[PDB]
Symmetry: none
Subunit: 27 residues, 3 copies
């Protein structure tokens, strides 16, 4: 008889860090 | 006897890029 | 026969927030 389903996979890697933000308000 | 368990699932796909940084400090 | 493949892993989490932007214009 056929075996049972394989074990579910691991969660993926986290995404990369986001890019830098934009310039702040004028002084 | 039944066959072996199936092959393990693949790791999930990488997550999306993180959000852009917040605005900088005042000038 | 071996069982079917395992369910694929769930997608990774979004990355953390990017660095703060630079200081704003001198104004």
């Amino acid at each position: 008889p056929p075996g049972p389903p394989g074990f579910p996979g691991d969660r993926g890697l986290p995404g990369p860090v986001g890019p830098p933000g934009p310039p702040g308000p004028p002084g």
